Amino acid sequence: SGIWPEQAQRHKTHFQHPNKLHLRVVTLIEHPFVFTREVDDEGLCPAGQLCLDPMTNDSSMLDRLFSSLHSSNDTVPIKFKKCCYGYCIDLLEQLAEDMNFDFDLYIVGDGKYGAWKNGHWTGLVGDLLSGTANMAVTSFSINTARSQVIDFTSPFFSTSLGILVRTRDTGEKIYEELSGIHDPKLHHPSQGFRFGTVRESSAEDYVRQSFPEMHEYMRRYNVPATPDGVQYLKNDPEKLDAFIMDKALLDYEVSIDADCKLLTVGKPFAIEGYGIGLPPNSPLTSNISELISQYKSHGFMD
């Protein structure tokens, strides 16, 4: 008793087996990808993952959270513990099972992508450039000037930008006959067409770098998050009109729309791609690429 590996495998590996490599993975606050909810009285997540949100994008805070999670102190408060579940959690679990690495995932304080602000990068790009975060396996659109500061991995899902407008009540029901970026009514507000986008996102930076003259309305109509904007659009007072975002993020919102008003129309344009940020000088990039290729070939990711 004590020397046998099966009898001793209670809190450690089988027999001097290399445990999961502790990595720093970060995710967003988007509900279609990770549904932020509360924990039970025991402080665990049976269906979701033990994701922590400190309400701040501080490197020391996440360092302390990872130091407390590795040890058995369990000093995290009750209301700080969250249960994240969705596509990102399942993908991270599959990657951890197929590559044997630690699936510790924390919630970023800001909850957005992070565009060029104050002459630097915020959100996830700032954490990737600082050196704290090691992987960025989540919804992350590849921008023009953003893919040159960090090494994006192979996009697991070829996403695109999709216009999300409401069906104006008219004798058939009419709507916004938009064709895409080349549409004339998209650049100039057609009869006071309010422009709205996600704050500190890739599409926002793309619009600011392409045509900054129409970015004032988008900056003044910054929404806190995607579900908040969806709920504001579904509300009776029509405050915003344009909700251009990724197609995969808005598909879940259109599917659960009980009002049959929000829908994604228009031809697929501006292929962004859900990239994965990863700092250079890392041998795990090839393994992640091979795993993504295997998932796309087998079809289990779909």
Swiss-Prot record:
Assembly mode: Heterotetramer. Forms heterotetrameric channels composed of two GluN1/zeta subunits (GRIN1), and two identical GluN3 subunits (GRIN3A or GRIN3B) (in vitro). Can also form heterotetrameric channels that contain at least two GluN1 subunits and at least a combination of one GluN2 and one GluN3 subunits (in vitro). Does not form functional homomeric channels. Found in a complex with GRIN1, GRIN2A or GRIN2B and PPP2CB. Probably interacts with PPP2CB. No complex with PPP2CB is detected when NMDARs are stimulated by NMDA.
Glycosylation sites: N57, N73, N287
Extracellular compartment spans: 171-302
Organism encoding this protein: Rattus norvegicus (Rat)
Disulphide-bridged cysteine pairs: C45-C83, C51-C84
Family: Belongs to the glutamate-gated ion channel (TC 1.A.10.1) family. NR3A/GRIN3A subfamily.
PTM text: N-glycosylated.
Full-sequence portion shown in this chain: 493 to 901 of 1135
Residue numbers binding glycine: S139, S141, R146, S202, D246
Compartments where located: Cell membrane; Postsynaptic cell membrane; Postsynaptic density
Role noted for this protein: Component of a non-conventional N-methyl-D-aspartate (NMDA) receptors (NMDARs) that function as heterotetrameric, ligand-gated cation channels with low calcium permeability and low voltage-dependent block by Mg(2+). During the development of neural circuits, participates in the synaptic refinement period, restricting spine maturation and growth. Forms glutamatergic receptor complexes with GluN1 and GluN2 subunits which are activated by glycine binding to the GluN1 and GluN3 subunits and L-glutamate binding to GluN2 subunits.
Tissues/organs with expression: Isoform 1 and isoform 2 are expressed in olfactory bulb, frontal occipital, entorhinal and pyriform cortices, hippocampus, striatum, thalamus, cerebellum and spinal cord.
Name assigned to this protein: Glutamate receptor ionotropic, NMDA 3A
Chain positions recorded as D-serine binding sites: S141, R146, S202, A203, D246
